[PDB]
Amino acid sequence: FLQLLCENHNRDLQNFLRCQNNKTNYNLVCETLQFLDCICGSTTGGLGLLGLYINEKNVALINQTLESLTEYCQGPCHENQNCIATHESNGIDIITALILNDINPLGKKRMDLVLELKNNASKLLLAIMESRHDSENAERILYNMRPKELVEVIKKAYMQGEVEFEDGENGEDGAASPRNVGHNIYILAHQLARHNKELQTMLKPGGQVDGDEALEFYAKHTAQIEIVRLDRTMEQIVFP
Amino acid sequence: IETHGRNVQYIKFLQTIVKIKKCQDMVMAELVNSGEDVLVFYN
Amino acid sequence: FIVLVKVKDSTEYTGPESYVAEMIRERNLDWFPRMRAMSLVSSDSEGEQNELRNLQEKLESTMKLVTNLSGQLSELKDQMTEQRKQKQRIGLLGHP
Amino acid sequence: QNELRNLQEKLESTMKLVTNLSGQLSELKDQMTEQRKQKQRIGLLGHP
Amino acid sequence: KMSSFLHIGDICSLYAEGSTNGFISTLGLVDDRCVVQPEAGDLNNPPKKFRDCLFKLCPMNRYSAQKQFWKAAKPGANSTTDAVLLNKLHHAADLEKKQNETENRKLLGTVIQYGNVIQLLHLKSNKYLTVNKRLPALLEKNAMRVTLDEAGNEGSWFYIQPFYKLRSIGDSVVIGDKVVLNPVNAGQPLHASSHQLVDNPGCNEVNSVNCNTSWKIVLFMKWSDNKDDILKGGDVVRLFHAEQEKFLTCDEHRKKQHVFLRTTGRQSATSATSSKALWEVEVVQHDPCRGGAGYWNSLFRFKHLATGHYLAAEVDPDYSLVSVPEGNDISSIFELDPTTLRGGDSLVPRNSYVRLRHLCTNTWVHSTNIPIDKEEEKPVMLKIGTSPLKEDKEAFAIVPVSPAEVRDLDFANDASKVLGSIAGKLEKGTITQNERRSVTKLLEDLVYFVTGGTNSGQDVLEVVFSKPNRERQKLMREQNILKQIFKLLQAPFTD
Amino acid sequence: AMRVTLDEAGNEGSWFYIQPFYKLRSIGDSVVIGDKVVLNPVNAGQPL
Amino acid sequence: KMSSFLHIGDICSLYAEGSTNGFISTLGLVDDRCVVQPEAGDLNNP
Ligand SMILES: Nc1ncnc2c1ncn2[C@@H]1O[C@H](CO)[C@H](O[C@H]2O[C@@H](CO)[C@H](OP(=O)(O)O)[C@H](OP(=O)(O)O)[C@@H]2O)[C@H]1OP(=O)(O)O
């Protein structure tokens, strides 16, 4: 509920809550949310495998807390990203851990939940990164994923293969194809690639080889839209 | 019983509320709270 | 240039040579003085390699810091000594 | 006939140098004298 | 001088105030709880030894990965994490410990204030602080055990709070605040329980229970002397000459602490550097360690570690060099001359050439080699006096002494002495029960601590390159390792 | 013993080793005014 | 006064120390080797 309340229009509502007055009323909750999420995953470094199993349905609230992370995520670049930047240097780890790994128990609705969490976390991170340009800020989240291109490539290949293997005939009820999740990850990586050169080198390598799922997925999308909103902006957008 | 959150009152009573090979395993855990220091005794 | 260069091992007379002596193999379309070289705009060697609004600001800061590293400390010490002496007079005033 | 980024930087340097040519020297001299005096008190403390 | 006490990592000490007014005293190195000694001297006058209250303002590092590392003993009971998973898992815990450091370094700078939660650690023993929540004290079970850890745990979690807490919360901590701490997780605040202890007339148990036990913030040295090169404080040196390549050695030869220097063997090689170079040099002010740090007009006493003996000199007449038990005379307070070069930058010298002036006789100190005794060639009795000439032959300098070795040796030597006492108990008759459970099996653990050189490789007969310490082995031979041999003889002989 | 000469022009026996008595003052540092400077000819060998 | 002795070309002198404690003394102008004179005064008093 708190996350839902906070999410109401950003800029003034978002910003106002996010910073406040009175030391954020003995609250500057975004850091708290990150800490809570860490406790829930209590990775404290590498997430203990299963913590997710322990979460049981309970991680979905933290998923909704991760959703409330994206609830304190959308658009308002400065306030949001002030917190985002702080978190990227500062905690970034829950998101990093999610990107880095899957869940030990083969969860029932859990596969979908995990995918949703990745997409969400991915969306939040992506939004923040894009707005920032914030190169070393993304370099720090890129310092979160030092595994880089190799890790991304492996994940993309695996997700796409799984999705093809069990293509689901459940239309527009959630694009949680393994490839769909991977596509979201690919978009984030490209957005990340605008920050970091080494990652870009890895990406160029991904683009040329004995073709692969990676080139096909980019083809399914290499947009780099670059629209500019309201006014006074020089913005660059991607979306699959 | 063993630590000074109480006194040295009966181990036998404690054992009675949990004194088969399972009993021996349980006894090892109980002894661990209550291990050494003449818990069984000085003999 | 291509005629004289063509002809030998390519290692000899290197720098531009063995630079470009590989560069024809991958044919990468970008050898030539497109616009950026042009000559000119020397600007007296860029004012002896001296920088922007910032360089002057940096000079001010350096000067200020070195100069500032001594005087206030001295002033405080002397101030304390003078103050110590008046207190002595005050003690005499309230002395018996 | 006043010059570039550089002329202003040069002015700063000249001012700094002339001003700087005196105060620290003075400070060091006084510091040494005060220090010399405490040592005297120290000598009295360890005097017999 | 705007305000003090702004940096975690301070060089300070502690003192008990109230019922029994003692100090933070680790009884030896192998024990587990400190004591409160009225054996110790005044609050205004610390004892002949005071090197035991060596705490430092530690940051609050984590322990959870280290806890889940130690969950590992429960996994020893049971496996499967197992193998690589288990390793990587505890390897990750180790990385997290590395990360604790890769926080503390950044952490230096913080103004230490009221109401904070900080950690501690010794230096002389270099052991940790952790109060148990389920393991009691020796006298009363209600009091909690305050432990000395090798690694440190969650009972390092304190509440820096003065006596009344009249000094309101948030401000910096005044040096002199009667700091009544409180364990976060364990509850029960610390107590100076006035109770007689084993081998201790004399000492009182440090423990944790609800009481009104006050303390004091007792400064020893500012944080800016954390520079390890900077020869400050009580740091220890070696009085090793360089043109002769001989250290200044003391010995109670004729039941008199003759201070001299041994005939130097080898030399084409460097010093064999025996343990008779135990010297700590400190400046003199009645409140200890006054301010200014210029080290120019600073005046110094000379202190030997293992003996309870400081260093003076008086006249010969047929000027002397023997060691003195006390620390209040002027004739022990000697002087220095830094490197004999043109230096106004000598605010803190470093590990280089020194000299001496006197104060009373007020002359230089020569080192002219005059052999004296016919007891033994390559002699053990020389003369070091105070003469107003100075030559190049006074090349005395300072060793930045390796800290770890000193600590190891000291604990071994003290253990051996008790070991000797333990041996005496067995000799009189039998011994008790828990002495076997405490210290008897701790024999080779002290040996395998620095490994003693007891196992190495194999090559031609001269030991050269690398496996365990020759210094350690000779030192092992050294703290009556001979005495230990006699003690061992007695155990089998008694059987 | 080797002849130490007084030349009008100067030659290769002007080649010295500025070294104190013991060389306790370790090599590299500036020369203290008062060092007991035991020189050594480079080419000629024999010290003074 | 930070440290002395920083410039080749110094205006100094020399003194012998040890067995015979003399000075660097050119016997006249036309000779070829210096002498060590105990004729010369003290090390503290030239
Ligand atoms: N700078 C020096 N100049 C000349 N001799 C030196 C020296 N520093 C020490 N020495 C002394 O001269 C002896 C050797 O020539 C002796 O060396 C002893 O040093 C011991 C170190 O503990 C070694 O014994 P190990 O522990 O068995 O290694 C070693 O023998 P080693 O070749 O096997 O190492 C030997 O015993 C050593 O002082 P000491 O007279 O020996 O006390």
CSV table of N, CA and C in Angstrom, one decimal, chain F residues 4-6 31 33 36, chain G residues 4-5 17 31-33:
chain,number,residue,atom,x,y,z
F,4,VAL,N,100.3,13.4,-5.4
F,4,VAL,CA,99.1,14.3,-5.5
F,4,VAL,C,99.6,15.6,-6.1
F,5,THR,N,99.2,16.0,-7.3
F,5,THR,CA,99.8,17.0,-8.0
F,5,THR,C,99.0,18.3,-8.0
F,6,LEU,N,99.6,19.4,-8.4
F,6,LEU,CA,98.9,20.7,-8.5
F,6,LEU,C,99.0,21.2,-10.0
F,31,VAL,N,75.6,15.6,2.1
F,31,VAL,CA,76.7,15.5,2.9
F,31,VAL,C,76.6,16.5,4.1
F,33,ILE,N,77.8,18.8,7.0
F,33,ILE,CA,78.9,19.6,7.2
F,33,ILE,C,79.6,19.2,8.5
F,36,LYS,N,83.5,13.3,8.2
F,36,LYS,CA,85.0,13.0,8.1
F,36,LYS,C,85.3,12.3,6.8
G,4,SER,N,70.9,22.3,4.8
G,4,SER,CA,72.0,23.1,4.2
G,4,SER,C,72.6,22.3,3.0
G,5,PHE,N,73.7,22.9,2.4
G,5,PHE,CA,74.6,22.2,1.5
G,5,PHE,C,74.0,21.7,0.2
G,17,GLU,N,92.2,15.0,10.3
G,17,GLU,CA,91.8,14.5,11.6
G,17,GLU,C,92.4,13.1,11.8
G,31,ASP,N,105.2,24.8,-5.6
G,31,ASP,CA,105.4,23.4,-5.3
G,31,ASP,C,104.2,22.6,-5.9
G,32,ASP,N,104.2,21.3,-5.6
G,32,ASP,CA,103.4,20.3,-6.4
G,32,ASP,C,102.5,19.5,-5.5
G,33,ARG,N,102.9,19.3,-4.2
G,33,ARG,CA,102.1,18.6,-3.3
G,33,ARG,C,101.9,19.4,-2.0
